[PDB]
Amino acid sequence: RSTRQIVEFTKAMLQDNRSGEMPLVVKTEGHESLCQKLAQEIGRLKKKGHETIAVICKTAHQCIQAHAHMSEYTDVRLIHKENQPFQKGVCVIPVYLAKGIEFDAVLVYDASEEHYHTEHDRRLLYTACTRAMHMLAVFYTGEASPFVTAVPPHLYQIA
């Protein structure tokens, strides 16, 4: 139900039909520059018509940090419990609460090798990226997750 480009990107992460824009991978220096560039990309995606936009973090604890820092640049809804209603707009949400929800656009928060390197992490990263129906962006600080670096570079564009 996602785009061919998103399906091919995410399939390539598991090394161990509609069309859309290429997944975007974005390198950043630190959580503050990360949150700034996330905020800019959210503004771009809103203008292009995305109505449900998820910044997906690995854990609830990371969500709180992400939400606090993103709030410096834009307004974002923190998703922290199951009974929060699905609505249009921008949210910060952990993988385990995003499971089986579909968003127009997903921005993966800090897909670094520090945060995503175990096989458990691989399942979490895959789950996060497959929530995206129309646009996927993968942001990271420092060094990218091995599961991102492993994706053939023709399957994504860089910023």
Residue numbers in the entry: 608 to 623, 631 to 773
Can I see the authors' text?
Here, we present structural data for HelD from Mycobacterium smegmatis (Msm) in complex with the RNAP core and provide insights into its function. Next, we provide biochemical evidence showing that in addition to being able to hydrolyze ATP, HelD can also hydrolyze GTP. Finally, we demonstrate that HelD can both prevent binding of the RNAP core to non-specific DNA and actively remove RNAP from stalled elongation complexes. To summarize, HelD clears RNAP of nucleic acids; this likely happens in non-functional (e.g., stalled) transcription complexes or post-termination.
Our long-term attempts to crystalize Bsu HelD, RNAP core, or their complex failed; our cryo-EM experiments with the Bsu RNAP core were not successful; also, our recent SAXS-based data for the Bsu HelD–RNAP complex were not fully conclusive. We also solved the X-ray crystal structure of Bsu HelD C-terminal domain (CTD), which was then used as a guide for building the model of Msm HelD. Previous biochemical studies used HelD from Bsu, which is only 21% identical with the Msm homolog. Selected sequence homologs of Msm HelD are shown in Supplementary Fig. 14, revealing two main differences between Msm (Actinobacteria) and Bsu (Firmicutes). The other difference is in the HelD-specific region where Bsu HelD completely lacks the PCh-loop.
